[PDB]
């Protein structure tokens, strides 16, 4: 009957739901302060509260929308779908949870939007020349990955300001390379040239039309260019139903956030688009560089993968930046850039080998635990991702959505999406902690029989100044009567020490360092045994001084674990199969075995007196292992009969025993037959 909420939720209909998923509470005077309250649904149900007055909400896992996952990227009309659930309805109760799953496929033939963002520093003039054959060739090789690929183009040459640019010391650097019998272009920060197009032959021509500029400061403006290419969807030509590949091609180290201080650039980068009608970054002289933080958030939020097509001698910085820009990839570029075709095809294949989920707008009170199915039906806990996938393969994530306490009565949208994917799961989450009869309540002073109080969930509830079992003994004074069962067995305390009986219920006057709950002031939130300066070492919660252990802990002080890896032996058996596990350690078995797993046993009757027991049952149907029906699993040794126990010359133990039939049987116990235990039992005892 009396279980948890018996003492913890009786004072409040919201509290009983706050306290435990098993509790219910009747209304409409079904059990008009009969005796038990809250308890378990089933106890009230049996004690005349079977009708739906019980106010017993349950948690639920429902799917609002499940458009089926698609096999092919070109399969337009119905939107090509990359994940299975689309919209999910989640209903929680306090300290409860529900499971769901996320199926994600690396859909085959999925369209590709690729932008070629080029380093336009003078060392690249021969690259622009080599690249004259790309676009056409890049797309051609990519036709195998997908039938639909678009190619765009842009460039960067660093911020056109005093310390980066040759400062325009003279006029001569307004249109540079006058220094070396040639001509080249001025510095522009970031430029956009070609939006993404299916007419990829346009790239061949657009790159031939370009030429390089001069940079004094070796570090590149590549981070502004990446961020703008990443952010400016409207010009870059990113279509949401496509993978976005930003290819960054360069021969040099990048310039980063707050380095811009040298040019008087101190304005924070807000991660916004600043490219105007001239397809030019107008912020190139006023805004600083984006941080690794900003790049990561914007490319993740908008599903842009970055490919670093970087020459060999600077790879160390790009690889290290990618570690701090998750989801990106870095390859090695040839000095003539002829391998961009291959670099990109492999970079794409690498990008599509990882499935990773991110949850947007997740509230502080909810915890989403993941177990990721990386292979077959095996799941690894603590993972938002799986590695080693091919295009056309799937990944399956198991998610547990748990809520702590009782968060506010608002509907929140948890967006669970693979990174780089447009499709996402919207989980719509609400919290059922109220009783319907909590809202359907009209306190109104009167109605609590003859009195002044409140009313909820089918019963009256007089507050301070009126209290009583129903409506009486405001501050005692009608109290020196009625007695009542204020304590078990009528042992006559006023109320279990910390409290006093008040007209059928006790009132706890204590208000120091915690709370007291229950009819007889039974539950002390603050009073239990410390293990090392803390109640039960922080490995459980207390209720009435009784500590309720957490997962994988036991004992009064919750310091005895139920974890067994520390008492497990090298053979996979707890206590090596000969001993008892206790508090993460091992209790010695009678023959005299010793050590953490009973590894050593110098006294132990030789194995022959333990192995005969197996032979005696597996072959002769006698012994403890026969009577206990245990030999078949206990003895995993191979036992063979032989006509003769031969001079093997190897590690064979000569064992012997006299049986129930007054016969003497000899056998040999041989160790390490390619890791197996082999017994040779004479056919003729």
């Amino acid at each position, epitope marked *: 009957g009396p279980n948890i909420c018996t003492t913890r939720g009786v004072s409040s209909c919201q509290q009983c739901l706050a306290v435990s998923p098993m509790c219910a509470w009747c209304s409409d005077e079904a059990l008009p302060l009969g005796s038990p309250r809250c308890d378990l649904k089933e106890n009230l149900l049996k004690d005349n509260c079977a009708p739906e007055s019980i106010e017993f909400p349950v948690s639920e896992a429902r799917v609002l929308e499940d458009r089926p996952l698609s096999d092919k990227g070109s399969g337009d009309s119905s939107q090509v779908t990359q994940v299975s659930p689309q919209r999910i309805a989640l209903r929680l109760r306090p300290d409860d949870s529900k499971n769901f799953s996320i199926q994600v496929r690396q859909v085959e033939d999925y369209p590709v939007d690729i932008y070629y963002l080029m380093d336009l520093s003078y060392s690249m003039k021969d690259d622009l020349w080599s690249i004259q054959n790309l676009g056409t060739k890049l797309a051609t090789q990519m036709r195998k990955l997908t039938s639909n690929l678009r190619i765009g183009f842009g460039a960067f040459v660093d911020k056109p300001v005093s310390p980066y640019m040759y400062i325009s010391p003279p*006029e001569a650097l*307004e*249109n540079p390379c006058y220094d070396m019998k040639t001509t080249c272009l001025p510095m522009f920060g970031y430029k956009h040239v070609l939006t993404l197009t299916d007419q990829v032959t346009r790239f061949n021509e657009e790159v031939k039309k370009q030429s390089v500029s001069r940079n004094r400061d070796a570090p590149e403006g590549g981070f502004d260019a990446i961020m703008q290419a990443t952010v400016c969807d409207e010009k870059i030509g990113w279509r949401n139903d496509a993978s976005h590949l930003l290819v960054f091609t360069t021969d040099a180290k990048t310039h980063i956030a707050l380095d811009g201080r040298l040019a008087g650039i101190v304005q924070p980068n807000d991660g916004q688009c600043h490219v105007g009608s001239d397809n030019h970054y107008s912020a190139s002289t006023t805004m600083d560089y984006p941080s690794l933080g900003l790049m990561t958030e914007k490319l993740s939020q908008k599903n842009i993968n970055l490919i670093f097509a970087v020459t060999e001698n600077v790879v160390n910085l790009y690889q290290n930046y990618s570690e701090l820009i998750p989801g990106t990839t870095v390859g090695v570029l040839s000095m003539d850039s002829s391998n961009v075709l291959q670099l990109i095809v492999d970079a794409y294949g690498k990008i599509r080998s990882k499935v990773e989920l991110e949850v947007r707008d997740l509230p502080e009170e909810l915890s989403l635990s993941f177990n990721a199915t990386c292979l077959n039906n095996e799941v690894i806990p603590g993972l938002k991702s799986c590695m080693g996938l091919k295009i056309g393969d799937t990944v399956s994530f198991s998610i547990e959505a748990k809520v702590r306490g009782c968060p506010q009565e608002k509907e929140k949208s948890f967006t669970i999406k693979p990174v780089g994917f447009k499709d996402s799961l919207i989980v719509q989450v609400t919290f059922d902690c109220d009783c319907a009869c909590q809202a359907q309540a009209e306190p109104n002073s009167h109605r609590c029989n003859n009195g002044n109080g409140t009313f909820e969930c089918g019963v009256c509830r007089c507050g301070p100044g009126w209290l009583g079992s129903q409506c009486e003994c405001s501050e005692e004074d009608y109290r020196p009567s009625q007695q009542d069962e204020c304590s078990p067995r009528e042992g006559q305390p006023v109320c279990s020490q910390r409290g006093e009986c008040l007209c059928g219920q006790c009132v706890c006057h204590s208000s120091d360092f915690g709370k007291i709950t229950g009819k007889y002031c039974e539950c002390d939130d603050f009073s239990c045994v410390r293990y090392k300066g803390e109640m039960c070492s922080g490995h459980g919660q207390c209720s009435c001084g009784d500590c309720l252990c957490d997962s994988d802990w036991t004992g009064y002080y919750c310091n005895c674990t139920t974890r067994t890896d520390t008492c497990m032996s090298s053979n996979g058996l707890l206590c090596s199969g000969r001993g008892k596990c206790e508090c993460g350690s091992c209790v010695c078995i009678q023959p005299g075995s010793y050590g953490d797993t009973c590894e050593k046993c110098p006294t132990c009757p030789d194995a022959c007196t333990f192995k005969k027991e197996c032979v005696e049952c597996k072959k002769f149907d006698r012994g403890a292992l026969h009577d206990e029906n245990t030999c078949n699993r206990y003895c995993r040794d191979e036992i063979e009969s032989v006509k003769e126990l031969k001079d093997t010359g190897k590690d064979a133990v000569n064992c012997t025993y006299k049986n129930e039939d007054d016969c003497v049987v000899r056998f040999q116990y041989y160790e390490d037959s390619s890791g197996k235990s082999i017994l040779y039992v004479v056919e003729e005892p």
Partner: antibody
Amino acid sequence: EVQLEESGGGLVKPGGSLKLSCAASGFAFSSYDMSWVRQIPEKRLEWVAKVSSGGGSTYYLDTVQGRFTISRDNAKNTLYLQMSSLNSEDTAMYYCARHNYGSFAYWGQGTLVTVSA
Amino acid sequence: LVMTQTPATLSVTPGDSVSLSCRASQSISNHLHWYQQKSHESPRLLIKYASQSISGIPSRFSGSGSGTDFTLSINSVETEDFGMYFCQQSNSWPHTFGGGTKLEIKR
């Protein structure tokens, strides 16, 4: 103080050749670009050729290219212009000049070249 | 590239002010210089890079302009200002000079 002195001008028969020199002192000769600019009888100035500070890059007027060579000896602090296949159009006062980022900041006194039969 | 320079000749009474104008067929940013040439003497840089004067050149000489149109103004012309003036472009190969202006002093 910058000192520039050109020499070697004179009368050359058409189709001929002639080498002009320009000595320099008072400055770090190898730290600056050098140019030859000529003043045609109409008093028009025309840039002829440029040699970079280290001598690596050499630029010529299109109607001069393939006939003239500009060179320098940074140890001898002397600039040269070796002309060949000379025409009447090449008659002019030749001036060597020191650069300041595209400008000709300092000029010589001039050496007169006459191309005539 | 063609550098057009006007006026070709100029007669200025001492104390009066004048200006010369340089026109480039394309944009030459600020890559335009001005020179002065007196009789039996070589050209001298007056103004470099459209408006930057030099070191011992009077403030009376002030250059201005960008791209395609540049000026050289001379406030209160002195007797010693007589002589030829030239603009020169350093943007694109070959470098080019304007036709030149002959400044004469009225007396």
